[PDB]
């Protein structure tokens, strides 16, 4: 089954201000998705170090960058933590909630979007590029889920029948019409280098087919 739910109205308000608002530099995107793929990888590392079974699901520690120009996708994969039912629906939006208001109280203020992974939002970033964002998790803990949402003030959470991931996640952005310059080599590593260039992982570009 598929289940719908309504997001906070913080979060609906965050995601319409993201869509609506001029803003050109869009491509700090990536570097706040990548750093939540860096702080997954920590995570999962940390707990490691006290329970070595916690990497029975995957050793390999890394971040893969997968453009597709034909089905206009961007994938972000992680090896990191991923992340359970409940954050998924309830523990990382609660966190949101209060990030979210002091966010929007920052650029009342004079501060612009670039700084939105400093209120911990940074994953909401996503809707500068994409008209549609797929989650695609799994945590030792839960089964393997896929979270979506096209805004509007909903998402979804259904338990995902697509290939077994051992843990971690995936964000597929689906890419809005004008910003298919997300899917060129050159441009994803020029923005890997601008912003993303000390990573304590391994990030891979894959190139297309
Ligand atoms: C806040 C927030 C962060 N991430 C988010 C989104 C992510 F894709 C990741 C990730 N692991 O790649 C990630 N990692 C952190 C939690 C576990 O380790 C750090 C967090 C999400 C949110 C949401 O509100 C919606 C969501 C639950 C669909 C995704």
């Given at each position: ?5 309504a ?43 006290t329970d ?59 501060a612009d ?16 590029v ?16 896929a ?22 996640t ?40």
């Open positions: 089954e598929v289940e719908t739910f997001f906070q109205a913080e979060i609906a308000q965050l995601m319409s201000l993201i869509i609506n608002t001029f803003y050109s530099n869009k491509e700090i995107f990536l570097r706040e998705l990548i750093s939540n793929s860096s702080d997954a990888l920590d995570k999962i590392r940390y707990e490691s170090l070595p079974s916690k990497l029975d699901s995957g050793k390999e520690l890394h971040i893969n960058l997968i453009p597709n120009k034909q089905d206009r996708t961007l994938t972000i994969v992680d090896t990191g933590i991923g992340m359970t039912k409940a954050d998924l629906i309830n523990n990382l939006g609660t966190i949101a909630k209060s990030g979210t208001k002091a966010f929007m109280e920052a650029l009342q203020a004079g979007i670039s700084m939105i992974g400093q209120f911990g939002v940074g994953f909401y970033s996503a809707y500068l994409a008209e549609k964002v797929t989650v695609i998790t799994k945590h030792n803990d839960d089964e393997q889920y979270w979506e949402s096209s805004a509007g003030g909903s998402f979804t959470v259904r338990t995902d029948t697509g290939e077994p991931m051992g843990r971690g995936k964000v597929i952005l689906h890419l809005k019409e004008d910003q298919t310059e997300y899917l060129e080599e050159r441009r994803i590593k020029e923005i890997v280098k601008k912003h993303s260039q000390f990573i304590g992982y391994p990030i891979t570009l894959f190139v297309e087919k």
